[PDB]
Every structure is written in structure tokens, then in C-alpha cells.
Design a binder for this molecule. Structure first.
Ligand SMILES: [Fe+3]
Length: 698
């Protein structure tokens, strides 16, 4: 099946039956314990929501492609409120070239290491077979309302052998999601008066996609295979007015419909696979060069996250990420029938950002130890890891899996990650599963680097109205989370029913500081001698919720499937406020009717629960007025089908959001000078949308 306590699988047939518009987050989010949200409660960049697992934030959601990590979004500025102006790392592989997607959540994912506190998403691509095969896929949607941007997607795949010890696979994809119109949120915007009059919260950022990848599989011996593959990906956007604080200037209005940020992503990887008497072996090297070229942006209060016209033009943040890994596997026949995996892993993250370390100290005063101008554009860190997994069978069916992962981070230090996962067959139909593990999140190179500096004249400062600075902190402790999961599941004859309770105890979550650690000297007027905050380690935090699934075979050709997330609590224990805004529940329901041998119709409905914004503003004072707005529960229904016309060609068509339920971004969560708050109305929900698909394959 596709659901077990902690794990979920998405097949290629699953993707073809609920086709994404462009980004795979559309289909990944429908899994239990998975939401689409930002990394904090600011509402900033609210239309750029990424995959969140169990309310731990997208920053704790490790994206893999065939086991190799994706770190491209680390090349984007990590804002004061923990929000990069990034669309996530799920749009790198085209939808119709994915074989399957694995989603590992909670304690079963801590073994993967740094950034797996929420979970792990492994995007697995279709490989070459014993023959030569190829495919051609075309998706195109048509929203009822013209303001919402439409998506068009064309991809191909091609695979096969060349010699008798050499195989290959290539795929190319070209896709475009039109941006929402600039004025799509007009009339729904928050109250805007004074200098901020007319400023609109923006719709969904558009994107152009150029993806190219080719693979060479060389099986030199019976037991040994060596693979080379290279990837070239480009993502240019279509700007529609998005700024951090929903303010606007003239540089913005000039760039509407223009390309203000482009991500070149380059990936080369040498993979080796070996399998013999004693067991199996795997080791790879990957180099990921990300170039994040975008228009320069200010770094001070309201000018944070807006096109800075004093320094017009593009800069280029460059991210060289190097990951090498290797593991061997061992079946053991001892006092208990077990399996043993032994592996190591090394990563290097080089970050060149010529624009984030530029905020000077002429208005708040010089900071001792921090130069005012020409600070280094470079940040870097490395983690070396060793690990071992003991997959034990105590008695046939029942399984126990303790494991230890050790990481040495060249700035923060040592981390011991002890995982223990238990699966008990209480019956041939019922399985109880429990697990507890202490996951790992090393600070990102913006929270670390003490040359990274943001400034505010007071509005963003916690516990005052005077000007203040926020600064990096290279003494930070890593984020650690104890992820308790306990679940049970019944599985027999297509009938599956399961419920799981998770409670991740979130120790040392990095966030913007609360108490000032210093004060500067110098500056201008009322702003001089501004206080100094640094990125802290929030002592304790908690997330808690429920994961459920129920699949009933109504008839032989009919299947009713259900996935349920219910978020019980998400609390920053130090401040008390929420740490992430997710719906109270999410219930996805699909009815899969196999109408004929050569036809299949699908009906989908997704219930979203209530959504509550944050209690306290950037000051820490309880918000007032329209910043308390909540989003009411609502549902999105859809119909679709896939009409097979031959063993070579297939056609799909359907409608998303049958009832045209629409939501509009009104701004960020809280109010500021001139711009009232928007509360939970931080994103645009798309309306009724028709779509069609085409797949030719041999
Ligand atoms: Fe300000």
C-alpha cells in the first residue's frame, strides 16, 4: 500500500491521476502529516509556501532526488522572520519524469541527518529498463478567471542500453506557470493609508522551467555498477509585485511581468553500486552549483525584501554544495536475525552572497567586531557523519531498528542522533508501530555568519520602539527535536485503516532574538546607539498532531481513499505564540473508478480546517484589528479522468476546484505603519481550473 505509520509513497500512476500544474508540492502536500506553509508566522512571502512535515517548517524538510540532496534554496536570503523569497526545491524534477516519491516523516527520518527533523522527501526518477523506452508528456490548464496564471508543461524521457554493460537515461522538460495578475488581490487587500495607500499584496509568482538531465549506467562487473549523470535546470520567475512587507516603489511597477530572479542549478553526480556475497554497497559524489541571480534588495526594516533603487541591477549569490556518501549493508545470522548498515557522509556548503552583508552602521552606530563596509561575501560549513542501523527481527513479523548517527559540524560541533523504531505485527492484519528519535538541524549560513546584519528603526524590534540591529551568531547550538510517534494500522485485502499520533519536542529552535545582547555607539538622531539582537536558540517548543488514513474497496473497480492530518498544537514555549500557521486539519479524499479496461475516472475533495494567525507582532504586543482575521474551513473538489486510447497513447482531462472556492492574499499577518494586517489571509487560493494531459510512451 501507499501509507504506513510514518511513511507515504506516491506512484507515477498517482501523479498521472492527479497531475500537478508544475511544482510537485501540489501532490506531495496531500500526504498525511504534510502541509503547505511558510517557515514562520510573519506572512511574508505568503504565496511562496513549501512542503511542511508535521508542523516543523519547510526548513526541516529534506528534499532528495534519487537519494542526493537538494540545497539550492539555501542560496536565498534568510529573512528576519525566517522566510526566504524562494519557491522551494520541489520544482527541480518535472512531474511526468518521476517514477515515485517517498515521504518519510518523524523518527523514521532522523537517520537521514541534518534537516530531517520534520521529514524527508525523496523524488525518484524513472530509470532505464532492459530495453529502450521513451515518453512524451504534455499538460496544460485553463483557469476560469483570467487573473490567475495558467501552467503549460512539456517533458520527454528516453532510456535504454547501449552496450551490454552500459545503459542510459535522459529527460528534458520545459514548463511555464504564468504569474497571477498584479491586481488580482485588489479589493481584498488590507487597509492601506498614508504613504502605503494603494500598495497591493501580490498574487502567485510565476516561473519558467528549463530542466535537462542525462544518465549513464555502467555495470562493469556482475556485482558492480557505476553511474554518471548531469543536470542543468533554470527557473526564471515572472514578478507580480511581491515584497516582504507588501510595500511598493517605482522599481517594482517597472518589473511587473519581467524576470527579477533566476536560478541556474547544475548537478553532476558519480554513483557506484556493488552487491555480492556479504551484501550490498552504495557510494556517490554530487556537486551542486546554484546561481541565484536577482535584483538587489534593501536590508533595513520596511526596505527589507524590496527592490532597492539606490543600487539597481542584478547581483548573483552563488552556492557550491558538495555531497559525498557511502554505505554498505550486512545480513547477520546470530542470536537474533538482524541486518546491519554501515555508512559515512561528508558535505560542504560554500555560499557567496555579495548583497546580504552590506547593511552599514551609519544610522544605528558601529557594532564592535563588525566592519561597516566591505564585509566578506563568503560563508561556509561542513558536516562529516558516521552512522549504523541495526534492522532486527526478534520474531517473524516483528521488527526493531536502533541506530546511531554522529555528525561533526566544523563550527557548532558534535551531534549524537539516537533513533529507535519498532514495528509489531499484533495480527496478520494489524500492525502497531512506535518510534522515538532525536533529529538534527544545523544552523544555516545566514543565522551563523556574524557579518549578516539587518536593521530597523524600531518596528521590528522585540520589546521596544527604538532602532535596533539583528546579527548572526556563530556560537549557536544546533536544533534538536525528539520525535515521538505511536500508531496502529489495519491492512487486509485492499482495506487499510490507520491512525498515528506524533509529538515532536523541539529543543533549541533558532529564531530572531528577544533580549538585546549589546548596544552600538554612533548614528544619526533618534536612531543612534541602536540595540543589538542576535539569532538565539529558543529553549523549548512543541508540535503535536494526528495522522490518519482509510482506504475502502467499495467494489472491485472502485476505490475510496482518505488521508487525514490534524494539528493539535504548535507552540513556541518561550514566547507562547504559534511557530507555523497550518490548517487545523486537512482531509484529502479520492474516489478512483476504473470505469472500463481503457478508462478511469477520479473524484477528489480536500477539506481544509480553520487557520489562526500569530498572537504577537514583531514587538511582542498582542495584535489588534484585522490582524486577528482567521480563515474559515473550506473545501476544494475536483473531477478528472485518464482515457487510454492505446498501449502507446493516453489522454487525461479534468477540473480542479469544481465549486470555484477562492481565497485572496490581503497582506502579512500583522499591521504596520499604513498597512493594516491580514491575519491568516496570506495566500491566494486558485479558482476553478480546467486541464488536459497527453502521454505518448513506448
Ligand atoms: Fe521600520
Amino acid at each position: 500500500t501507499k501509507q504506513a505509520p510514518g511513511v507515504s509513497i506516491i506512484t507515477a500512476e498517482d501523479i498521472a491521476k492527479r497531475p500537478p500544474s508544475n511544482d510537485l508540492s501540489q501532490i506531495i502536500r496531500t500526504m498525511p502529516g504534510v502541509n503547505l506553509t511558510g517557515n514562520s508566522s510573519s506572512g511574508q512571502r505568503g504565496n511562496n509556501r513549501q512542503i511542511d512535515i508535521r508542523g516543523m517548517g519547510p526548513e526541516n524538510t529534506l528534499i532528495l532526488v534519487d537519494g542526493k540532496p537538494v540545497s539550492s534554496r539555501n542560496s536565498v536570503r534568510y529573512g528576519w522572520r525566517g522566510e526566504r523569497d524562494s519557491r522551494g526545491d520541489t520544482n527541480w524534477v518535472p512531474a511526468d519524469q518521476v517514477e515515485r516519491i517517498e515521504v518519510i516523516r518523524g523518527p523514521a527520518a532522523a537517520r537521514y541527518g541534518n534537516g530531517a527533523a520534520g521529514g524527508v522527501v525523496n523524488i525518484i526518477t524513472k530509470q532505464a529498463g532492459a530495453e529502450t523506452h521513451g515518453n512524451l508528456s504534455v499538460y496544460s490548464n485553463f483557469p476560469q478567471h483570467k487573473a490567475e496564471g495558467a501552467s503549460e508543461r512539456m517533458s520527454f524521457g528516453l532510456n535504454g542500453p547501449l552496450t551490454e554493460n552500459l545503459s542510459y537515461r535522459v529527460y528534458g522538460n520545459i514548463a511555464k506557470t504564468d504569474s497571477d495578475d498584479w491586481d488580482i488581490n485588489a479589493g481584498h487587500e488590507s487597509n492601506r493609508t498614508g504613504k502605503q495607500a494603494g500598495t497591493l499584496p501580490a498574487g502567485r509568482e510565476g516561473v519558467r522551467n528549463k530542466d535537462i538531465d542525462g544518465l549513464l549506467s555502467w555495470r562493469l562487473t556482475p556485482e558492480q555498477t557505476l553511474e554518471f549523470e548531469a543536470g542543468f535546470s533554470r527557473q526564471g520567475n515572472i514578478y507580480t509585485g511581491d515584497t516582504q512587507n507588501t510595500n511598493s516603489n517605482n522599481y517594482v511597477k517597472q518589473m511587473l511581468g519581467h524576470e527579477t530572479n533566476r536560478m541556474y542549478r547544475e548537478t553532476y553526480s558519480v554513483t557506484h553500486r556493488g552487491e555480492w556475497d556479504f551484501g550490498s554497497s552504495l557510494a556517490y559524489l554530487q556537486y551542486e552549483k546554484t546561481r541565484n541571480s536577482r535584483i538587489n534588495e534593501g536590508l533595513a526594516g520596511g526596505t527589507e525584501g524590496i527592490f532597492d533603487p539606490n543600487n539597481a541591477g542584478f547581483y548573483t549569490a552563488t552556492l557550491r554544495d558538495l555531497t559525498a556518501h557511502g554505505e554498505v549493508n550486512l545480513p547477520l545470522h546470530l542470536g537474533y536475525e538482524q541486518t546491519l548498515t554501515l555508512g559515512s557522509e561528508w558535505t560542504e556548503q560554500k555560499l557567496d552572497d555579495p548583497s546580504s552583508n552590506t547593511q552599514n552602521t551609519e544610522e544605528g552606530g558601529s557594532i564592535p567586531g563588525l566592519a561597516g563596509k566591505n564585509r566578506s561575501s563568503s560563508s561556509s560549513a561542513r558536516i562529516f557523519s558516521l552512522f549504523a542501523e541495526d534492522n532486527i527481527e526478534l520474531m517473524p513479523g516483528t521488527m526493531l531498528t536502533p541506530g546511531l548517527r554522529w555528525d561533526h559540524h566544523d563550527i557548532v560541533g558534535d551531534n549524537w542522533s539516537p533513533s529507535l523504531n519498532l514495528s509489531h505485527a499484533l495480527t496478520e492484519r494489524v500492525t502497531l508501530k512506535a518510534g522515538i528519535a532525536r533529529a538534527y538541524k544545523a544552523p544555516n549560513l545566514y543565522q551563523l555568519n556574524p557579518d549578516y546584519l539587518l536593521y530597523s528603526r524600531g518596528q521590528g524590534c522585540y520589546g521596544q520602539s527604538t532602532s535596533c540591529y539583528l546579527r548572526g551568531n556563530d556560537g549557536l547550538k544546533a536544533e534538536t527535536s525528539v520525535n515521538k510517534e505511536l500508531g496502529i494500522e489495519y491492512s487486509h485485502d485492499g482495506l487499510v485503516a490507520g491512525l498515528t499520533y506524533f509529538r515532536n519536542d523541539y529543543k533549541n529552535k533558532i529564531e530572531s532574538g528577544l533580549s538585546p545582547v549589546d548596544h552600538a555607539s554612533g548614528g544619526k538622531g533618534d536612531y543612534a546607539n541602536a540595540a543589538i539582537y542576535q539569532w538565539e536558540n529558543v529553549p523549548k517548543a512543541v508540535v503535536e498532531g494526528l495522522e490518519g488514513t482509510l482506504t475502502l474497496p467499495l467494489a472491485d473497480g472502485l476505490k475510496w481513499s482518505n488521508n487525514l492530518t490534524y494539528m493539535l498544537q504548535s507552540k513556541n514555549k518561550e514566547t507562547g505564540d504559534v511557530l507555523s500557521v497550518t490548517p487545523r486539519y486537512t482531509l484529502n479524499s479520492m474516489l478512483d473508478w476504473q470505469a472500463t479496461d481503457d478508462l478511469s475516472l477520479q473524484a477528489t475533495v480536500t477539506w481544509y480546517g480553520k487557520q489562526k494567525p500569530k498572537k504577537y507582532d514583531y514587538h511582542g504586543d498582542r495584535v489588534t484589528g484585522s490582524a486577528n482575521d482567521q480563515l474559515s474551513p473550506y473545501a476544494i473538489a475536483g473531477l478528472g479522468g485518464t482515457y487510454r486510447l492505446s498501449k502507446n497513447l493516453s489522454l487525461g482531462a479534468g477540473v480542479d476546484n469544481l465549486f470555484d472556492k477562492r481565497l485572496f492574499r490581503a497582506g502579512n499577518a500583522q499591521g504596520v505603519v499604513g498597512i493594516d494586517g491580514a491575519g491568516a489571509a496570506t495566500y491566494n487560493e486558485p479558482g476553478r481550473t480546467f486541464y488536459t494531459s497527453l502521454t505518448a510512451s513506448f
